[PDB]
């Protein structure tokens, strides 16, 4: 039993809700919140911009030190950093950005990072400003993640379309 509330159950391990991931994280304080990161951990907009803003830019400060030490992530890769005031940890995961021409096949590799954590609060990878089809992203999530994932979909219309179109 965990403290996630109001989710619809899609499969044995995947759950979904129309919610703002920032507000969900502040309420639940999950062990792991997933960020929709880019390889430079430049948290400018979308999910990343919103999560970073909620940390008063502390996420960006920590991320800049990480990059200065380690260099950029790989598309499809991840790193674990602090969750600041939102969660114990933040798993920064880089899905492919279609608006940059990146290979959508890397979306499965991106979701594989979730399997290293027993329970996660997460957005749909490569959705939103990353340009991929969110229905496809949900299909990849369900077919790749085996650990318990609680998906927050900000847009009510998309959520309804995601639920209503789920096979
Ligand atoms: C992954 C993408 C595309 C699908 C969106 C959806 O789930 O409807 C969620 N996404 C966001 O980038 C996004 C999420 C939360 C916030 C935000 C942007 O900005 C303002 C804010 O306070 N929160």
Swiss-Prot record:
Q: Which organism is it from?
A: Severe acute respiratory syndrome coronavirus 2
Documented activity regulation = Inhibited in vitro by GRL-0617.
Bilayer topology annotation: Multi-pass membrane protein
* Reactions catalysed, as given in the entry: Thiol-dependent hydrolysis of ester, thioester, amide, peptide and isopeptide bonds formed by the C-terminal Gly of ubiquitin (a 76-residue protein attached to proteins as an intracellular targeting signal)
User: Which ranges carry the Macro domain?
Assistant: 1-167
Which N-terminal stretch is annotated as signal sequence?
Answer: none
Where does the UniProt annotation locate this protein? Host endoplasmic reticulum membrane
**Annotated phenotype, changing residue 31 to A:** In strain: Mu/B.1.621
Q: How is the quaternary structure described?
A: May form homohexamers. Interacts with N protein.
Q: Which residues of the full protein are shown?
A: 1025 to 1191 of 7096
Purpose? Responsible for the cleavages located at the N-terminus of the replicase polyprotein. Participates together with nsp4 in the assembly of virally-induced cytoplasmic double-membrane vesicles necessary for viral replication. Antagonizes innate immune induction of type I interferon by blocking the phosphorylation, dimerization and subsequent nuclear translocation of host IRF3. Also prevents host NF-kappa-B signaling. In addition, PL-PRO possesses a deubiquitinating/deISGylating activity and processes both 'Lys-48'- and 'Lys-63'-linked polyubiquitin chains from cellular substrates.
What's the protein here called? Papain-like protease nsp3
């Amino acid at each position: 039993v965990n403290s996630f509330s109001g989710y619809l159950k899609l499969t044995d391990n995947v759950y979904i809700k129309n919610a703002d991931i920032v507000e969900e994280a502040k309420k639940v304080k999950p062990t792991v919140v997933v960020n929709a990161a880019n390889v430079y951990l430049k948290h400018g907009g979308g999910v990343a911009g919103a999560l970073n803003k909620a940390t008063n830019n502390a996420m960006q400060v920590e991320s800049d030190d990480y990059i200065a030490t380690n260099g950029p992530l790989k598309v499809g890769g991840s790193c674990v950093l602090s969750g600041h005031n939102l969660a114990k940890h933040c798993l920064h995961v880089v899905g492919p950005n279609v608006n940059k021409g990146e290979d959508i096949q890397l979306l499965k590799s991106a979701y594989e990072n979730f399997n290293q954590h027993e329970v996660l609060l997460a957005p749909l990878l490569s959705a939103g400003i990353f340009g991929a089809d969110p229905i496809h992203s949900l299909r990849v999530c369900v077919d790749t993640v085996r650990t318990n994932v609680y998906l927050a979909v900000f847009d009510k219309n998309l959520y309804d379309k995601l639920v209503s179109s789920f096979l």
